[PDB]
Curated annotation (Swiss-Prot):
Keywords: Carbohydrate metabolism, Cellulose degradation, Glycosidase, Hydrolase, Polysaccharide degradation, Signal. Belongs to the glycosyl hydrolase 48 (cellulase L) family. It is an enzyme of class 3 (hydrolase). This is Endoglucanase F. Residues 113-136 are annotated as: Disordered. Residues 125-136 have a biased composition (Polar residues). The gene is celCCF. Probable endoglucanase involved in the degradation of cellulose or related beta-glucans. It catalyses: Endohydrolysis of (1->4)-beta-D-glucosidic linkages in cellulose, lichenin and cereal beta-D-glucans. PROSITE patterns: CLOS_CELLULOSOME_RPT, DOCKERIN, EF_HAND_1. Gene3D superfamilies: 1.50.10.10, Dockerin domain, Endo-1,4-beta-glucanase f. Domain 2, Endo-1,4-beta-glucanase f. Domain 3.
């Protein structure tokens, strides 16, 4: 029997759960897939409200796990896993084993440089540049009996809004698509949405392929998928809690545990340098594990031929603290129920847990906020790490890993999403490393929460950085990073971030006994319930400062290249964001937004992001469980 829960907060979770699952609210598609947001005019990471992400799926799992905890019904949790496997993990038809089985572990992929401006793309492939070897593929094919990868592709056009369809049919839904392909300066506003399955039926003469990669020969028809490691790890984290909660009530989610475990086994591809180069000695091809940084990097990607048989797999050299999940690492390396089938699965995750905790500590600023991360590929071309750039296992520090428009570590959300996982680990194990990190981080953020007399509140929104951490010496440990500082640029009322903050503070307060953290968590939860509730969950009005880019952001198209989007929009040099997404003019909020831009005003919106609503619901359940009285 599960322990008693605080009835007040349990009721708030149930109310939110009902609002999120209410078909009249429109959070899900007819196929049962949650959208990024109810509203369609949405550009921030995905560029359309009704595309979904693996991130949304992992929140859907967490939400359903918590619901099973309170209702004793776990069929919704099992359903979230069925939808994920059916629509987000490429099937046999999507990643033909005929091509995947032709993968060569001694030559995983062909090197191509990364550039700091989208105008330098397509990037030319170079077969003469060294590529290390993949030590885990043989472990995976042996344990699972297939060459296909079991991980979630990160973004999905749920209703086929772009019109690419399934496997080039232009008519089916959902539709696998990808966006980001052109480096750190390619914001969400500067991409050319493309299909994952490219048969050359849309776009230009060779589909969209030669917009990104240049080869000596003619581009072949091919598929390609990209994983978002933080989402796959959150799926493991959510499944662990569903397994614990189910077992307390004599129920079982055995089948979902096996999928989560298999996913965590493949998730190890993110522990490796993009082209399997040695960590700390980027000019040399790796010989196996010497190319493993053991951190959850920006992505792992894979693809292969459609009409000819071949394939490739890449990891990522860039690491952001925001993606780490020491809790998922603890689960996969110590819990017998989640022991991966592969030979080195559990032990690699045990190595990741230690390395992740070292990474967080190395990045902790003088004040307490966690700085960006590190890369094993300077400028994405394995260049020499400049002057006295501090390093972590030979990897140079980067303030904003991967993206600079805007900087990936300028959003406060990374702080809470990542530290929440550290709080869960500390709660479960009492780990000293987790405690040291949290004691300092919590003290910082507790001094940044502002409560107003009218019930509203504000938390850090945009942050900035100065300096760099001291070079990591594993034996000396934390130096205090006196020359690394965080600065809060502006405050706001991001409800998803505040909910994630409440969650982190709740786990931390339950273990440490820190009253300040417990009352700030409850006050955040109460303030949101009382002052921001609406018929769809919670919401507030926010300014969309970058929406002017809808009309004035030019998209780079290489000289001489012309193509068409499925709806007929012409892709050619000179196009703006809106020119290759003309369907946006039919959005119900379009006139309102343009009218605001015309009047010289910053557009505002009241948004219902699926992850934020789920984050709030989960935060209430966590508090109900940890603080019953
Ligand atoms: O890319 C991180 C994360 O961003 C989320 O959107 C943020 C956006 O980055 C920020 O500029 C704006 O102020 O707030 C929104 C909402 O928090 C996005 O919703 C996530 O899917 C994405 O992973
Ligand atoms: Ca840019």
């Amino acid at each position: 029997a599960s322990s008693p829960a605080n009835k007040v907060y349990q009721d708030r979770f149930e109310s939110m759960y009902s609002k999120i699952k209410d078909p009249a609210n429109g959070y899900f598609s007819e196929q049962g897939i949650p959208y990024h947001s109810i509203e369609t005019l949405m550009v921030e990471a995905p560029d359309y409200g009704h595309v979904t992400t693996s991130e949304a799926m992992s929140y859907y799992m967490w939400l359903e796990a918590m619901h099973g905890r309170f209702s004793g019904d776990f069929t919704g949790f099992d359903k979230s896993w069925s939808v994920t496997e059916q629509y987000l993990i490429p099937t046999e038809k999507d990643q033909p084993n005929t091509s995947m089985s032709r993968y060569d572990a001694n030559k995983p992929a062909t090197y191509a440089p990364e550039f700091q401006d989208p105008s330098k793309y397509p990037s030319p492939l170079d077969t003469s540049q060294p590529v290390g070897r993949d030590p885990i593929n043989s472990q995976l094919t042996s344990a699972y009996g297939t060459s296909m990868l079991y991980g979630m592709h990160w973004i999905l056009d749920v209703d086929n809004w772009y019109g690419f369809g399934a496997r080039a049919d232009g008519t089916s839904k959902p539709s696998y698509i990808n966006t980001f392909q052109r480096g750190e300066q390619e914001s969400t506003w500067e991409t050319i949405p493309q299909p994952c399955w490219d048969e050359h039926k849309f776009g230009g003469q060779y589909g969209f392929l030669d917009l990104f990669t240049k080869d000596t020969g003619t581009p072949a028809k091919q598929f390609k998928y990209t994983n978002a490691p933080d989402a796959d790890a959150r799926a493991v984290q959510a499944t662990y809690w569903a397994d614990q909660w189910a077992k307390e009530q004599g129920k079982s989610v055995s089948t979902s545990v096996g999928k989560a475990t298999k996913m965590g086994d493949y998730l190890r591809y993110s522990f490796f340098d993009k082209y399997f180069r040695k960590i700390g000695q980027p000019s040399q091809a790796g010989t196996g594990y010497d190319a493993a940084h053991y951190l959850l990097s920006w992505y792992y990607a894979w693809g292969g031929g459609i009409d000819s048989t071949w394939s490739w797999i890449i990891g990522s050299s860039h690491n952001h603290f925001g993606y780490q999940n020491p809790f998922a690492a603890w689960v996969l390396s110590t819990d017998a129920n989640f022991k991966p089938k592969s030979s080195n699965g559990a032990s690699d995750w045990a190595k990741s847990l230690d390395r992740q905790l070292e990474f967080y500590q190395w990045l902790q600023s003088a004040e307490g906020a966690i700085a960006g991360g590190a890369t094993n590929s300077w400028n994405g071309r394995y260049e020499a790490v400049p002057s006295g750039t501090s390093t972590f296992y030979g990897m140079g520090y980067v303030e904003n890993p991967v993206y600079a428009d805007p900087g990936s570590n300028t959003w406060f959300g990374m702080q809470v999403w990542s530290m929440q996982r550290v709080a869960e680990l500390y709660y479960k194990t009492g780990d000293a490393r987790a405690k040291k990190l949290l004691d300092k981080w919590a003290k910082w953020i507790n001094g940044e929460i502002k409560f107003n007399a009218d019930g509203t509140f504000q938390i850090p929104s945009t942050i900035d950085w100065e300096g760099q951490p001291d070079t990591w010496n594993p034996t000396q440990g934390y130096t205090g990073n006196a020359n690394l500082h965080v600065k809060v640029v502006n405050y706001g009322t991001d409800l998803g971030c505040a909910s994630s903050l409440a969650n982190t503070l709740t786990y931390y307060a339950a273990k440490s006994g820190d009253e300040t953290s417990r009352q700030n968590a409850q006050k955040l939860l109460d303030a949101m319930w009382n002052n921001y509730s609406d018929s769809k969950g919670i919401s507030t009005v926010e300014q969309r400062g970058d929406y002017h880019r809808f009309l004035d952001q030019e998209v780079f198209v290489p000289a001489g290249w012309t193509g068409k989007m499925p709806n007929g929009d012409v892709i050619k040099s000179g196009v703006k964001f809106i020119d290759i997404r003309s369907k946006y003019k039919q959005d119900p909020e379009w006139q309102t937004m343009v009218a605001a831009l015309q009047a010289g005003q910053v557009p505002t919106q009241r948004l219902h992001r699926f992850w934020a609503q789920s984050e709030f619901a989960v935060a209430n359940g966590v508090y109900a469980i940890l603080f019953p009285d």
